[PDB]
Design a binder for this molecule. Sequence first.
Ligand code: CA
Ligand code: CA
Ligand code: CA
Ligand code: CA
Ligand code: CA
Lengths: 212, 189, 189, 189, 212
Amino acid sequence: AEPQLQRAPVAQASRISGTVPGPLSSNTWPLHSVEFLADFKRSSTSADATTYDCVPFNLPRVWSLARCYSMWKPTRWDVVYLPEVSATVAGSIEMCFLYDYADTIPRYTGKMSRTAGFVTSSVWYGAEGCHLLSGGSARNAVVASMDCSRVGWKRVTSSIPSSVDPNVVNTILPARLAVRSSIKPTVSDTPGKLYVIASMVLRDPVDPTLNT
Amino acid sequence: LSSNTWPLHSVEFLADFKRSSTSADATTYDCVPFNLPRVWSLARCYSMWKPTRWDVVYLPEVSATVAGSIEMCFLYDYADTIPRYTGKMSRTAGFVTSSVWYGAEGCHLLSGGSARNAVVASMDCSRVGWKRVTSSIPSSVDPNVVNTILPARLAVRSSIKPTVSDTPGKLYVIASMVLRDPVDPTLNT
Amino acid sequence: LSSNTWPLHSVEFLADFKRSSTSADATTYDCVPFNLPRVWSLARCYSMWKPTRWDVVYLPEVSATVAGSIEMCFLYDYADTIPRYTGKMSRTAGFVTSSVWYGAEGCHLLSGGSARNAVVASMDCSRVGWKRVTSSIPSSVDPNVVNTILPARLAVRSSIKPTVSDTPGKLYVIASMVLRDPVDPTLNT
Amino acid sequence: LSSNTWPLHSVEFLADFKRSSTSADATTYDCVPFNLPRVWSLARCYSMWKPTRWDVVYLPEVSATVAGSIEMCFLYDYADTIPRYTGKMSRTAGFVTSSVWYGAEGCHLLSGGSARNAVVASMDCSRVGWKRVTSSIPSSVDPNVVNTILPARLAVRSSIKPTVSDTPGKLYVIASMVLRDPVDPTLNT
Amino acid sequence: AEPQLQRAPVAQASRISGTVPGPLSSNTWPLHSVEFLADFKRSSTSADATTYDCVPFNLPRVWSLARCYSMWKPTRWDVVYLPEVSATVAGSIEMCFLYDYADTIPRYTGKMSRTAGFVTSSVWYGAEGCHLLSGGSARNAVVASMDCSRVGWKRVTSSIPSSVDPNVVNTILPARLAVRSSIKPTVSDTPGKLYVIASMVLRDPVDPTLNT
Ligand SMILES: [Ca+2]
Ligand SMILES: [Ca+2]
Ligand SMILES: [Ca+2]
Ligand SMILES: [Ca+2]
Ligand SMILES: [Ca+2]
């Protein structure tokens, strides 16, 4: 055919609309995952509960994805206790959630029981929780569920301002998981494992390297 | 109805309406559970609260000859300046004013309803979210930090400087809220 | 509708799109009423505001041969670092880039609105709650405190460094919001 | 609802009811946005306004022993002579009169409704067209020129000459209007 | 009914088989994405081409996901040039790929043309490449495609051993993109942008924090 006589424009707009396509470019992105939280450490001297900040950057794998978004909203967050001790082991594991950073960490059973999301279990009970981490059946699992309803959209951070008014911390920290041992062993030990079954929604992308 | 949630309707004395003989500034009251002993005793057992009502009624107890009036309004931003005069009060949310000796008819508001002849200052509670219950306020902090725990402040002012400081009536709070996540009363801050 | 809630749709010049001949950093604009003189005149009369739209359209006014592009995106966390380059921009929310000379078709967005071949950067307003109207930003504080008042920041970047500092266009904001509890404009901070 | 139009409901302190110890003449107040600081701050952002409500409530703050009463009426023509006495006031539009110490019951009118025992002077707003918003009034001009910008004047009078000038109560404006064509607040005259 | 008389076992095995469930737990995970590579910098003094290592850690968003896997295999890797200059701009952009770290970087057109994946374009041609980044239509785009067939499974790294024998570098570096300017402007400038349209397969998960 005839060679086409192209008309050359002074320019030609180069335009892109919206976050460049890829795995985490959608306005929002829902994510469900099982994440090892920590060892159930049993102090032999302290009766104080151990605290765990329920925020994305504390979940290595989830964090990898979460740092690509600026906002997140927890939908599930459930911590399962997996026993790794015989049925001869005395003691109990106590768990509850603290929804205000300003609130004091429970130092004993009574305090723990009076706190939201409270749960206790024979340190050797709950192995069936292993099946929770995969399929389901929380029938015989030791789980501490965090109240996620009513939790709004939180900014995704890579840190927690700890030496700051608890009120500013609250703006980023939906809740803290408080884990306590009902008794003091003669020597520190680790009766089981704590795995988190988190479900959240990420929103509004951001270059990971900028996210803090 | 359930699962970390139950409504609470209460009535409690808030404070005496004090008229300064020298200052024209408005007195400010933080609308949070810990400023109401009984309500506090309940709210402290929960981690989060959400005001559904919060109304402050002025009930007079002076002679029909006392001059001056009471002015009330709500401040929803800690950073906002406290009204120094009538015009300023009149321009802010929930503004209400009434002769200092009027308002006794609003006592049935304390039990029952009919705010028909009451002197009430209602706080805008719709669209007020869940706030963490606290045992105090960080007064030396950025107002924005305070706003996190303080839904609003009630600003009360006297339209007149009496010859001597005096209290013509009292303020009663009629609050209605919902509490959420259980917490040991002694550990609530 | 009503009851301490006034809806508002405005259009205002936001700022000049400035291109630095030395810095590759983006310029950020705080998406809050006090940054728009006319809108501020209105918003300062209220304690609370809630953005419903907030769109910033770029209107060019340079030769079609000028080199470079304008890049825009929104930052929803004050803690988040300001983009220093195209990828950082292309990777974040509301990203949009267009040749610096392109855009005039966007004037229709201003009057009326038929955004087609318009260069707009829309902010995520859904799920943005009632914020407190302020007259400033506490930059000297924890970014989390700032977040309390800053729904988002618009990030505008020049895809390239002109040999001389210049401004090839202007940014106009098309905001839609609802205002809530009245305050004396002079006491609103 | 839209395209250069949104309703505005406001409440603001208008002025102190001042009783002259020597003059029997009525004091006059121009019912225009610029005489209400906050409302002005809003209205000035628009070129045209149209009053939908405009009610002025008298709220007393004196002893039940003060004698005399307040008289109010509206004047819809700048050329019209200001009422010198009770009969004259009583014969003009919106006329209302009440003992100077009565009216506190009308405070709920400021927030909510029920003008049931209020002392309100309502301006006839139906059939009041769009008027240009102004920052002032040409007082030395033909009344007809003034009528162009002045929907009406509120005439307030004391049915008695107290021994000394005094202010028994205050006047609060409860205005409701619609604004129309945007304008830079600083350029509005 | 009758209370069930539970039989208490000496223990109860706590077992989990396979990487804990979540977004990046599958043995393999395929990922396609558009990633801004860099500015097409035009030196006014050097004629040397600029090199870009075609490896995951150089793609911020992709890297977020890629660091959760230990092995990767490029399937596509295409670099698109987007012009941001008028049709009055003189010069050309030259691109090619170097598949051996030991190979010398081309210093001129002839050298560039003799190299695999070679491509040149009027610096003001190729705006239609914008549509490539989203839908498709590479009909009028300036693209430099990397030979991915025959590229095996490479270990995912967070760095490149640069002061090491090019042969060891080759074990981790599938290829380098060489970008050159056909001419020297009177002063350094940036005629356009380089975006990468990568496609790869990730395999064998690993805690991100361990991945280096
Ligand atoms: Ca962040
Ligand atoms: Ca608390
Ligand atoms: Ca304010
Ligand atoms: Ca005017
Ligand atoms: Ca590795």
